[PDB]
Amino acid sequence: HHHHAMWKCKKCGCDRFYQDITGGISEVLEMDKDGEVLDEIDDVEYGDFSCAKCDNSSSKIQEIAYWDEI
Amino acid sequence: HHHHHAMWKCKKCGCDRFYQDITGGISEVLEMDKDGEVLDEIDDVEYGDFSCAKCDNSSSKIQEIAYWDEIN
Ligand SMILES: [Zn+2]
Ligand SMILES: [Zn+2]
């Protein structure tokens, strides 16, 4: 289910991509007297993909990248 | 462990359950499918302001919206 292939930036050839976290919410389950969250349940919203080398970004990886099979 | 030392309580509600906003950070995709779906990811979330789960009393500091009770 892995190592089947790889996406590559259509502009620079990088195969390592980011995904912006747009927002979300944390359900704090435990905190300490000093005020630090120790246990939580996050529900992050994911956003546009980006290229680690050139920053080519879009909502869909397809526009910014191609699938190179191994 | 500090996991039962006590509880924070809203200075308006008395509620002990708080949220923390996610201002948003960056994720690091490590495995994506031919369909374009993320499998493995390393998220670097940036957290924001606490908000009471009832009041909505909110601040960047839990100490401004709540007080620490003590289980003793
Ligand atoms: Zn690129
Ligand atoms: Zn409250």
Word description of this protein:
Chain A has 70 residues and is mainly β. Chain A has one domain (5-69). Chain A has one helix and four strands. Chain A has one helix at residues 61-64; strands at residues 5-9, 17-31, 37-51, 65-69. In chain A, the strands form two sheets. In chain A, strands 1-4 form a two-stranded antiparallel sheet. Chain A has a two-stranded antiparallel sheet with strand order 2-3. Chain A starts with a strand and ends with a strand. The A-B interface holds A 1-2, 4-5, 7, 16-28, 30-33, 35, 37-40, 42, 44-47, 49, 60-62, 67 and B 2-3, 5-6, 8, 17-29, 31-32, 34, 36, 38-39, 41, 43, 45-47, 50, 61-63, 68. Strand 2 (17-31) of chain A pairs antiparallel with strand 2 of chain B. The complex binds zinc ion (2 copies). Chain A: Keywords: Metal-binding, Zinc.
Number of helices of chain A: 1
Structural class of chain A: mainly beta
Biggest sheet details of chain A: 2 strands, antiparallel
Helix content of chain A: under 10%
Number of domains of chain A: 1
List the strand order in the largest sheet of chain A. Answer: 1-4
Which word captures the global form of chain A? elongated
Instruction: Give a count of the beta strands of chain A, DSSP E runs of length 2 or more.
Output: 4
Report the portion of residues of chain A in β strands: over 45%
Oligomer description: homodimer
Spatial extent as radius of gyration of chain A: 17 Å
* Distance from first to last alpha carbon of chain A: 13 Å
Distinct ligands, ions and cofactors found in the model: zinc ion
Biggest interface between chains: A-B, 37 and 34 residues
Taken in chain order, the helices and strands of chain A follow as EEEHE
Keywords (chain A): Metal-binding, Zinc
GO molecular function, one term (chain A): metal ion binding
